[PDB]
Amino acid sequence: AMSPSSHRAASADLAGMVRQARQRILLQGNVPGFDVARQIELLHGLAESELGRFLLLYRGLNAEWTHRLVTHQPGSGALAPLERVFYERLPAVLATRERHGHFRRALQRHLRPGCVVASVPCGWMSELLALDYSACPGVQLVGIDYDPEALDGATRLAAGHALAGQITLHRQDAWKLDTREGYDLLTSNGLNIYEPDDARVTELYRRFWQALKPGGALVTSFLTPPPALSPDSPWDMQAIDPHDLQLQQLVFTRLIQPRWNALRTHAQTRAQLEEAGFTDLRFEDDRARLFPTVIARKPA
């Protein structure tokens, strides 16, 4: 488990996080569509869920939960009723599954025989292990992650895979990446959205650029700001169910309080990537434009 190391049992910290969320409900009262009692029911649904508990405690996703959430097939599995609504209806969850699809299409398009593909942070390597390698013999896969549990999980997920022997894993802080021209393709999801400082994200992109061979490509992603937050929000409100958005807003803002709130526009992301040395940017937007994918080229 992610915790201890807080030196306490996770159950003790969880009770605290639940108490704090309950107080925020009681002190702030009703919201449109969800009275106090209903909010308390939502909090209980979170606390009864394995993923819900992880989010209450840690306020972000790790390798395990990114994989399990992103690869969830709607209607499948053993989920409690409310838990299933969270897995299947929240606009941001729908968006990250769309994004996952765009990552797969982009990586597949750019794959060539013998190429070296890196994922940073690799997590369980869900996207790379899902690709079709039938016409790309000799691909080498590289996974970098700072979480030893992520690397263990990648190994376990790849154990029966055709490319199990083509994987090299490294425990490294992604923010300190210093590979020089080692990869043809690099994919990254779930780092920039946790870093509110724009310059720190630009520097991460620069390390990605430095790690790519000339002519290589980066596939990454970013969460975008909603209309309340930015005059330049790309959100298509006609592509978002109003009630499910209200549900997400209550769950995120009041209950979980997620750490993935470094939201950036297409133009901001373009500026960062161009500063880092990338050209020929292509954006692959999800339907509501909550979580675009970007493919960025390093000049030959």
Ligand X SMILES: CCCCCCCCCCCCCCCC(=O)O
Nearest distance, CB of residue 215 and ligand X, angstroms: 28
Radius of gyration of the chain (CA): 20
d(CA 31, CA 215): 51
Task: Identify residues 27-46 at the interface with ligand X (CB under 6 A).
Answer: 46
What are residue 218's DSSP bridge partners?
Answer: 186, 296
- Tell the smallest beta-carbon distance from residue 213 to ligand X (Å): 27
Please give the Cα distance from 283 to 296 (Å, whole number): 9
Q: How far is the CB of 299 from ligand X (least distance, A)?
A: 29
Q: State in angstroms the smallest separation of the CB of 140 from ligand X.
A: 25
Task: Give me the least distance between CB of 164 and ligand X, in Å please.
Answer: 25
As a residue count, the chain comes to: 300
The three-state secondary structure class of 186 is strand
What is the per-residue DSSP string for 192-217?
A: GGG---HHHHHHHHHHHHHHEEEEEE
For ligand X, give the closer residue by CB, 39 or 49: 49
Nearer to ligand X (CB atom), residue 42 or residue 116: 42
Binding mask 47-86 for ligand X (x = CB under 6 A): --x-xx--x----xx----x----------------x--x
Bridge partners, 183 (sequence order): 212
**What is the Cα–Cα distance from 163 to 277, expressed in whole angstroms?**
32
- What residues between 223 and 262 interact with ligand X by CB under 6 A? 260
List 295's β-bridge partners, or say none.
219, 282
Nearer to ligand X, 273 or 288 (CB): 288
Residues forming the site for ligand X (CB under 6 A): 46, 49, 51-52, 55, 60-61, 66, 83, 86-87, 90, 92-93, 96, 189-190, 193, 260
